[PDB]
Amino acid sequence: TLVGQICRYYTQWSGSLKVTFMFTGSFMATGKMLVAYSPPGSAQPANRETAMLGTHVIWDFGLQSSVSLVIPWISNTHNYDYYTAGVVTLWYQTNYVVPPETPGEAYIIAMGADLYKFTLKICKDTDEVTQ
Amino acid sequence: AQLTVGNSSITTQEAANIVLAYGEWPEYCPDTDATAVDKPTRPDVSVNRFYTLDSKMWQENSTGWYWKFPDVLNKTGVFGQNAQFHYLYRSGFCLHVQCNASKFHQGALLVAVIPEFVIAGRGEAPHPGFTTTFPGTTGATFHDPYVLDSGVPLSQALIYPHQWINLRTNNCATVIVPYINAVPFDSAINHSNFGLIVIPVSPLKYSSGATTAIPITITIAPLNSEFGGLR
Amino acid sequence: AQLTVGNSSITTQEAANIVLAYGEWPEYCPDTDATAVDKPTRPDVSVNRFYTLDSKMWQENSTGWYWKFPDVLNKTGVFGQNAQFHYLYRSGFCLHVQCNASKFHQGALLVAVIPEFVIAGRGEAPHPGFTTTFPGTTGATFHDPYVLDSGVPLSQALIYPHQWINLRTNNCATVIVPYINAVPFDSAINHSNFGLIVIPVSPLKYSSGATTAIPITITIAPLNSEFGGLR
Amino acid sequence: MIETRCVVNRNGVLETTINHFFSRSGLVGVVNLTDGGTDTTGYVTWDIDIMGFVQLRRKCEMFTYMRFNAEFTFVTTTKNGEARPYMLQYMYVPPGAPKPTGRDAFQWQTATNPSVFVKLTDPPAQVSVPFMSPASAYQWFYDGYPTFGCPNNMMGTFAVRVVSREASQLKLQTRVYMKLKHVRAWVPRPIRSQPYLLKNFPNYDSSKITNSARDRSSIKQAN
Amino acid sequence: MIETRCVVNRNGVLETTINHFFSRSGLVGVVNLTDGGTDTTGYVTWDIDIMGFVQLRRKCEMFTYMRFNAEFTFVTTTKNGEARPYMLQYMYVPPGAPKPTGRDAFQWQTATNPSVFVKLTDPPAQVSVPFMSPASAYQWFYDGYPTFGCPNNMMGTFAVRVVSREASQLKLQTRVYMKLKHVRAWVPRPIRSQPYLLKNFPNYDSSKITNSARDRSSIKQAN
Secondary structure (H helix, E strand, C coil), X not given: CHHHHHHCCEEEEEEEEEEEEEEECCCCCECEEEEEXXXXXXXXXXXXXXXXXXXXXXXXXXXXXXXXXXXEEEEECCCCCXXXXXXXXXXXXXXXXXXXXXXXXXXXXXXXXXXXXCEEEEECCCCCCCC | XXXXXXXXXXXXXXXXXXXECCCCCCXXXXXXXXXXXXXXXXXXXXXXXXXXXXXXXXXXXXXXXXXXXXXXXXXXXXXXXXXXXXXXXXXEEEEEEEECCCCCCEEEEEEEEEECCCCXXXXXXXXXXXXXXXXXXXCEECCCHHHCCCCCCHHHHHHCCEEEEECCCCCEEEEEECCCCCCCCECCCCCCCEEEEEEEEEEEECCECECCCEEEEEEEEEEEEEECCCC | CEEEECCEEEECCCCCCCEECCCCCCXXXXXXXXXXXXXXXXXXXXXXCCEECCCEEECCCCCCXXXXXXXXXXXXXXXXXXXXXXXXXXXEEEEEEEECCCCCCEEEEEEEEEECCCCXXXXXXXXXXXXXXXXXXXXXXXXXXXXXXCCCXXXXXXXXXXXXXXXXXXXXXXXXXXXXXXXXXXXCCCECCEEEEEEEEEEEECCECECCCEEEEEEEEEEEEEECCCC | CCCCCCCCCCCCCHHHCHHHHCCCCEEEEEEEEEECCCCCCCEEEEECCCCCCCCHHHHHCCXXXXXXXXXXXXXXXXXXXXCCXXXXXXXXXXXXXCCCCCCCCHXXXXXXXXXXXXXXXXXXXXXXXXXXXXXXXXXXXXXXXXXXXXXXXXXXXXXXXXXXXXXXXXXXXXXXXXXXXXXXXXXXXXXXXXXXXXXXXXXXCCCCCCCCCCCCCCCCCCC | CCCCCCCCCCCCCHHHCHHHHCCCCEEEEEEEEEECCCXXXXXXXXXXXCCCCCCHHHHHCCEEEEEEEEEXXXXXXXXXXXXXXXXXXXXXXXXXXXXXXXXXXXXXXXXXXXXXXXXXXXXXXXXXXXXXXXXXXXXXXXXXXXXXXXXXXXXXXXXXXXXXCCCXXXXXXXXXXXXXXXXXXXXXCCCCCCCCCEXXXXXXXXXXXXXXXXXXXXXXXXX
């Protein structure tokens, strides 16, 4: 992403993010997915029940073709790894349902961005460029 | 439309068509003698929200399912916690049943709410165990749908608050159920107030190449909950 | 809806949803020193109208296409005539990309406008020929879509004016591109201002019996053109 | 590092501005001057180029168009580095002007090439160069044929020599520092994910393509 | 060069003014000072003359009459160029005054000749000379007989020496830089198309005359 590349030019960041899921199936395919966010300090959920007990979205891609999940707050202060993460997961609420004579396989595309609350400080140089 | 209650958000269409059970809304209790002494708890923060079960797979051979409330929620979230302890309990519910199916699938589901729904023995006196009275979050499947396993015709099940799901017209149904009991408060652990039932009346049919199993998703929102003294 | 400009009329739906590139409309130039001496030509009679290319066939194995403007129009109609000679050139465009596909087809296309889009060598110093810089009316196909053949991630292509075409929701896209340059007028022959790109990000998929190739049609309408002294 | 906590407050917004992002004077080149009489040239020319180093090259290729003034600083030392009082001459050669052909050549006395004379024991010299392009901006992406010689958007050239009648045997290197000022930028680009093969062209190795994100065991496991 | 395009806009008008066209300090002469005791003079005199170099000579002969103030700068180095703390004296000798006859001669102590004492390790000295002519302008074209000694319009003379009791063996060259200021010009002339034969006079070779434009194959073909 661009957020990913710009953060490499700064030592500290913080703010909120946005993650968009976009389903490309056939028009007549249908089903539900569970888009969930486990905050930092906890391992990713073990099953759907514990993913459902926290911030999440039930997204039926037969009705809605795209869904956004705002992550409320994230921070990296900063070789002990100071960022305790937090995870987005995808669950099958239903099974992907397909009519006759249509592929039965599709792909999800994921996107990410910063909300206006996001900020950056302490300039530096990127680890990508070597020279 | 998108319904957002607490930290949960579900995708569903906006339709004023719903079924109020018996025609009344959930209400908080009229003031009583015991709760005048100790003011009851009316939580809505993280407690009253959408809970969505594991979806059920309807296949050509099925019979149909039932759930018992409050029981289905007894081990969930922060409701099951309050359901535990709290020897006094009252609440209504909002129930949304969904079905994801292509236009090439055909069938229909009867969906009803039965107060004091009692599964009986199929035998002697085989008192049905805690499995039929308290199936839990998963639920149970019917043996004899035609009699509902109560000894009662399914034809006449329509004097209960109900909605059809016909895969031709509508894929969803919503039933608002108030609290219905002969006493204002009761024990949520040893007494299930009502139960929910989804029976395919017309079996699922499709032509080869279609998905052989259609998911049915349940969503439960409590309404106007009240809890008592802490066990 | 039916859009009629000059002697050409296209069938398309009426939707206020469009993408203004960078948020500005095509404009005629602010008065300059050279054109105060010779007043520039602002033709719209038969010159500014819909041009529709040969449609492109998107198949399961594809990579994706690009076009260079003004170049794609350099041999067409009465625009290519004015594009020839006329050592001073300025213009905006209206670009409509269409896809004819059945509801049983699935896939998606990223569609973007890149100013000063430079294809590089895949090697040494293999300076890319006039074929990559000036592919003509037909256009070119990508070798490495993932890097755009510029040495740049396609993931980040979304800071360019763009629209998705998802065969699920929408079959068309429209991008209004103003004139973007570091100088008011430039040479239309030796300099292409920007370029247009259609890359399948999710490949085309269908089940046997469907059409194996889906056409993509381009339509170009110039906006606020200006031409200079005649070569 | 250290200091591991959570930052609940918004940061300062001033560090993310384009003009602050391209500020901070830094090293744009190193050139070496040996005054050896006739066995060695005895001067240096350095064409003004931003892209010579890939750190700042990557930050200008984030944009299509830019406009700015440059400020240069010359840090010059001798071998081991101990300094002695030798006069130097930094001549600037505008775009479209002939460069010195030799140490004593007549171009050094041209007045239209502005010069600065400073002794090597003095603090380093600073110079401010305006916006030099005939367009309204510099562009390092031009789709077409520029041809015409070396980098794009010619800013000029610096030449350095020692000021003496007889060649003084002296071995110099002049570090050039550039600070962009009043920077405007237009039409942002994506940041390059591939290694640079050569200057002036965005070539990439087709056989070996690096992927933008590193790899993990499975998609169903984050950590 | 590079950057090949069309410029649709008017340029800046400020660079074409007479006062900017004669600005930009540049090298007006080179003189050499060897202090050798009695085998070498030990000082230098430089008469103030604009026409000594033909670059600026050609730009003053564009006009009949000019008026201006001069600003001089002395860049002085020693052979190899390494500098040592020696005091110097630049004395200015007004028009109509006797010049130094030798290193220790009494003219160096005349007060009406203004002087400046600066060590050779210091930054170069600068001096501002007013408009010196008895007419209202300098004219390098005078039709008649001026006679009377050397160039026309005598501005003055500079003399340089080292300040010491005993002659220090030291070999110096002083580059003089002049910047015209507040320049007015009258009655413009045509620009010279012929080589200059000698100073002070506009002589030209009659046998060999160069033609103002170069040659082509035929008149009916441009390229």
